[PDB]
Amino acid sequence: GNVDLVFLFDGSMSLQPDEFQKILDFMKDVMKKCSNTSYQFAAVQFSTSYKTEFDFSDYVKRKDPDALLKHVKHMLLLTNTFGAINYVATEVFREELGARPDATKVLIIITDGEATDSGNIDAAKDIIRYIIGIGKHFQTKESQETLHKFASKPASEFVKILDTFEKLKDLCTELQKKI
Ligand SMILES: [Mg+2]
Numbered sequence: 001g002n003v004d005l006v007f008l009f010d011g012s013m014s015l016q017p018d019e020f021q022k023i024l025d026f027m028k029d030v031m032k033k034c035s036n037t038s039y040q041f042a043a044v045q046f047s048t049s050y051k052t053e054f055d056f057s058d059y060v061k062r063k064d065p066d067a068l069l070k071h072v073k074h075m076l077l078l079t080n081t082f083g084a085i086n087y088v089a090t091e092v093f094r095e096e097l098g099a100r101p102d103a104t105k106v107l108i109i110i111t112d113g114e115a116t117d118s119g120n121i122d123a124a125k126d127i128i129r130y131i132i133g134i135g136k137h138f139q140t141k142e143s144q145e146t147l148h149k150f151a152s153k154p155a156s157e158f159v160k161i162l163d164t165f166e167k168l169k170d171l172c173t174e175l176q177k178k179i
Contacts, residue, residue, distance in 0.1 A: 002103035003179055004056060006088050007043040010111040011075035019135070020074045023110055026165045028065035030108075033172035035063065040100070042092055043068070046084035047075035052091075056098030081115035081150060089124035104128065104179055108171070113137040114146050121150060128152050128179065132160045132168070 007027045011020065031041055040060060043053045054068040062068055088107060093099050107124065109131040131151045138144050144161050151158035162168055 001038045002100050003039045003106055003175070004093065004099050004103040005039055005041050005106040005108065005175070006092055007041065008084055008088055008107055008109045009043065009045055010079060010113070011045045011047040011077070012079045012111075012113060013047075013076045014113055014137070015074065015076075017074070019112065022165055023134075024069055024072065026110070028069065030172050031065040031068075033170070034176065037176070039175075040098070040103070041065075041068075042097065042099075044084065044088055044092060045072060045075060046080060046087075048077035048080055049075070050080075050084050050087040051075075052097070055092065056100075058098070060098060078116045079111065079113050080117040081109070081111065082117045082119040082121060085109070085121045085124045085129075085150060086119070089121070089127060093127070106130075106175065106179060108132070109150060110134065111147070114143060115150075128158075130158050130160065130171075132162060134162045134165070 009023050040056045042055045045051050045053055053072050058068060093105055105127040107127045107129045111133055112135045129152045131147045133147050138161050147159050148155040
């Protein structure tokens with residue numbers, strides 16, 4: 001029943017300060033609701049570059065989402081989603097970072113725009129992948145559909161297109177129900 005969950009969250013230049021803070025608050029809320037469970041967490045900010053803001057070992061030690069994220073600095077650059085997902089798959093889901101070999105791997109990708117880079121995410125395909133596309137850049141169907149390649153199948157389950165986070169059916173509950 002162990003789940004190792006990574007939040008992979010956009011820090012691009014398009015995010016207003018309140019919008020970036022709402023992404024932080026969303027991750028904290030999921031963690032608080034899912035705390036003291038078989039879930040362990042890590043979080044990675046991506047924009048141009050990728051930074052593990054806290055790893056699974058950190059999570060087990062402090063178990064305080066506000067302290068784990070207190071040092072995050074909004075990167076304010078690009079949206080290199082291909083590089084970021086590869087980074088998570090190969091550099092974050094590792095025993096050296098506290099990941100548990102027995103656990104089910106889950107990736108929650110949070111983004112406010114289309115990917116600026118290119119390539120493939122072969123190395124991450126066996127991870128259960130949800131993508132949340134937040135805000136105005138996903139107002140047309142075409143834009144939304146560009147996120148399907150990053151998510152598990154079917155997109156009707158794994159791609160979430162949101163005006164705001166409050167409209168999402170509660171993620172901790174849904175994960176505990178389904179994973
Ligand atoms: Mg953006």
